[PDB]
Design a protein around this ligand. Structure first.
Ligand code: MG
Ligand code: ZN
Length: 808
């Protein structure tokens, strides 16, 4: 054993030992309890970033911990390979997206290997290989013939200068983000998952996920947005019927979740596209401009609530079916066509959005709910105005004194008796649009035939292979310009036909990859029956916050679809969720000769407090998430090159709890490294003073007080570490506990025969308690202390007798 810790001299050997023993290559072995620990697989962008290293170290700790506790652990790794960055890199570097992607996979796989993650690499998948995406094409065709996938016209944002479609997040003030050209609203046929057929199941089955964070479930519930409400029809006044036809000339239909407040409605609001808006706008240019602006907006969903609410009166009136009030119709930008009837009633006194709308336009506010003796102020919103539980009806004639549910049913009865309304359930959930006008994604397995229509590709002819000899040029998406790809024959009649050229939303690949890991070479289905039955559901899922709502929702949807096809037996894919925190770092800049700032990467400055560009000073600025926005990313490879993998893993687990933001710290990295030196020196000094002995075990009566206190600390530490790994998932406090154990060890005389046995017991436990965090140095130190295989000695046991104190 060398005297000094040299991670370059031990980390390759340790990795080769694990690979040779194949501890991470797992099969469907019913002789051992399974554990499926899954970390969100990476986009092969070119090289790991610090977020990757944090995510997969957290996954590795949990995996290695459960391995030491006797579990058959599958910890798989793969590549979420489709998407825009490969296209972007192709347009910049004149290379093919596939070539760029596979070179990135090869480099990043090496980096992951160098960190010593206990990964079953025989289960590696790459979603851009046809051996993978053929199976989501297969699922598509099966759902398409059932109508769960369907074709329908939808509206997209066309950038005529870049010749491509943009999401609302890539549209700024109505113009494309990169071009600055005004976008054009185009209606084109696209494909959709009928996810709304599964809304009730996707909402109710959340109750099964006892170990999910409550706010993640809450966000799933809000996104599905089930409401139980009331359809209410407002007769159109005789003076307001010009230009209307059909049912729109008889009544205005709305949906409301507060029909108990129908006596307090003071006006109604319709979408820009509602026929009442069209008819009223016919001879009013101000309404035509307002309708045109609503149609031209590109507000993303995540920003819909923060959009300023605006309306225009129409001079058209409708009649409240309960009290006969004539109410004016307004056109408003927050009423969306397609959401229910595209029309709502407004009760400003008891709905805060209506309150602020009415207060802006000085529309009337009518109180119809009372909560105790609380004063109602028509000029100031109070939280109790919206209270649905403790309120009682007022100013409602026949309905006064009723609570929410009784007034709900009485209004239901009144309306139904008049033919003017009925109860109704609605969902905010929209169907899932999967068509993308992009090249580097999974082809959609549809052929368009003028005689046969939209025809699914037969299972025998899957995959529809995406050609990889393609370099996108930025003058439109390549597939629509490649007749050698889209020109084909109809699989139903043999006549001339054309393949669909749109590709699939890349969320599809990540909605089932965790099943594919169970049998990644299986050629007869998405996943083999034996492997799905054994592995079941993911026991632990570790990932980030970005896109989590949709990804979780989509993966739960796909599970229910795959279960209904007889491919899996679980209703839910993920039993536990750990969302890791972002990694943040300081930023640095120098001012421009053009009134702006040039952002400097931390690897290109030296800190004297103050900074200098590698030699004039730079400005040290604020701390924020590492990104290319302000060029403050720290390269994990330089951290590995300078200190080794264990230092990297230890710093990330020590610096903050996994869900907390982790602040980059040079001194913290160095502190992590010095601790590894300490751990190395402690074992080396123990073994230089007499060589290893048998670890103390059994009855400790007759041990000195100081050695009993060390064994108390020892088995108290083991209990704490076990609860931190297995229950709290708080690895930083577990590292500190082992540090406190080593401190007590340092202050304890262990030179006696019983002392050496306790010391051996202390060090044998500590190296095993830390093996999930820093396995290379711990594997190396364990073999100097004990001849058994560490993974067969297993997780350290708590000696409860070491914790019982001597009575008085
Ligand atoms: Mg349960
Ligand atoms: Zn045909």
């Amino acid at each position: 054993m060398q005297e000094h810790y040299q991670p370059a001299a031990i980390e390759p050997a340790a990795q080769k030992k694990w690979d040779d023993a194949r501890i991470s290559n797992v099969s469907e072995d019913a002789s051992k309890p399974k554990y499926y620990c899954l970390s969100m697989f990476p986009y092969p962008s070119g090289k790991l970033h610090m977020g990757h290293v944090r995510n997969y170290t957290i996954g590795d700790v949990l995996s290695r911990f459960k391995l030491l506790n006797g579990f058959n652990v599958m910890q798989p790794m793969g590549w979420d390979a489709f998407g825009m960055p490969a296209e972007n890199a192709a347009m910049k570097n004149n290379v093919a997206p596939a070539a760029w992607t596979y070179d990135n996979i090869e480099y990043m796989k090496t980096q992951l290997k160098s960190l010593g993650f206990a990964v079953d690499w025989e289960r590696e998948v790459a979603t851009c290989k046809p051996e993978y995406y053929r199976w989501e094409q297969w699922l598509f065709t099966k759902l398409f013939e059932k109508g769960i996938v369907y074709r329908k016209n939808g509206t997209v944002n066309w950038d005529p200068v870049d010749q491509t479609v943009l999401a609302n997040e890539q549209v700024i003030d109505g113009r494309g983000w990169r071009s600055g050209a005004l976008i054009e609203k185009r209606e084109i046929p696209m494909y959709y998952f009928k996810i709304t057929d599964y809304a009730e199941e996707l909402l109710n089955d959340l109750d099964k996920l006892e170990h999910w964070p409550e706010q993640v479930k809450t966000m799933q519930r809000n996104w599905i947005g089930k409401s139980r409400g009331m359809t209410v029809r407002f007769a159109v006044s005789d003076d307001s019927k010009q230009g209307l036809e059909g049912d729109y000339a008889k009544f205005l239909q709305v949906y409301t979740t507060r029909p108990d407040t129908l006596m307090g409605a003071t006006y109604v609001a319709v979408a820009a596209e509602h026929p009442l808006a069209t008819a009223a706008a016919a001879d009013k240019p101000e309404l035509q401009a307002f309708i045109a602006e609503c149609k031209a907006g590109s507000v993303a969903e995540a920003d819909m609530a923060t959009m300023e609410k605006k309306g225009v009166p129409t001079g058209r009136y409708v009649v409240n079916p309960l009290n006969g009030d004539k109410l004016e119709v307004w056109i408003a930008n927050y009423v969306l066509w397609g959401y229910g009837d595209g029309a709502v009633m407004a009760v400003p006194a008891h709905d805060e959005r209506d309150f602020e709308f009415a207060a802006k336009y000085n529309l009337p506010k009518k109180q119809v709910i009372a909560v105790g003796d609380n004063a109602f102020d028509a000029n100031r919103w109070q939280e109790w105005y919206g209270d649905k539980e403790n309120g009682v009806l007022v100013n409602s004639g026949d309905l006064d004194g009723l609570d929410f549910q009784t007034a709900f049913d009485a209004v239901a009865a009144k309306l139904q008796s008049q033919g003017a309304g009925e109860p109704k359930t609605q969902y905010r959930l929209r169907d899932w649009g999967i068509s993308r006008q992009r090249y580097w994604g999974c082809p959609i397995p549809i052929v368009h035939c003028e005689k046969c229509g939209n025809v699914p590709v037969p299972a025998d002819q899957l995959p529809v292979v995406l050609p990889e000899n393609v370099v996108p040029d930025g003058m439109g998406s390549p597939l629509a310009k490649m007749p050698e790809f889209y020109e084909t024959s109809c699989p139903c009649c043999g006549g001339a036909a054309k393949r669909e050229t749109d590709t699939m939303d890349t969320f599809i690949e990540s909605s089932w990859y965790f099943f594919r890991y169970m049998s990644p070479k299986f050629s007869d289905g998405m996943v083999s029956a034996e492997s799905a039955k054994y592995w079941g559901a993911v026991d632990q899922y570790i990932g980030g916050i970005e896109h989590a709502i949709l990804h979780l929702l989509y993966a739960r949807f796909f599970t229910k679809l795959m279960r209904d096809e007889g491919l899996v037996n679980v209703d839910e894919p993920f039993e536990r969720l750990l969302t890791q925190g972002m990694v943040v770092c300081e930023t640095y800049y120098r001012e421009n000769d053009k009134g702006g700032k040039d952002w400097i990467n931390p690897a290109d400055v030296e800190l004297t407090v103050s900074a200098v560009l590698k030699g004039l000073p730079v400005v040290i600025s604020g701390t924020e998430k590492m990104s290319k926005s302000k060029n403050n990313g720290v390269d994990p490879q330089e951290l590995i090159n300078a200190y080794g993998a264990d230092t990297a893993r230890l710093f990330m687990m020590f610096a903050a709890p996994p869900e907390q933001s982790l602040e980059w710290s040079d001194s913290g990295v160095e502190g992590a490294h010095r601790f590894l030196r300490r751990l190395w020196r402690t074992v080396y000094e123990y073994l230089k003073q007499g060589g290893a002995v048998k670890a103390f075990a059994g009855n400790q009566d007759g041990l000195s007080k100081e050695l009993k206190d060390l064994r108390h600390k020892l088995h108290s530490t083991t209990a704490k570490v076990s609860d931190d790994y297995g229950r709290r998932q708080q690895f930083n406090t577990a590292i500190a506990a082992v540090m406190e154990l080593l401190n007590q060890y340092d202050k304890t005389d262990t030179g006696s025969e019983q002392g050496r046995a306790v010391a051996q017991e202390v060090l044998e436990a500590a190296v095993r308690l830390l093996w999930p965090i820093v396995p290379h140095i711990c594997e190396t130190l364990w073999s100097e202390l004990n001849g058994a295989k560490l993974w067969e000695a297993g997780w350290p046991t708590v000696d409860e007798a070491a914790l019982v104190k001597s009575e008085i």
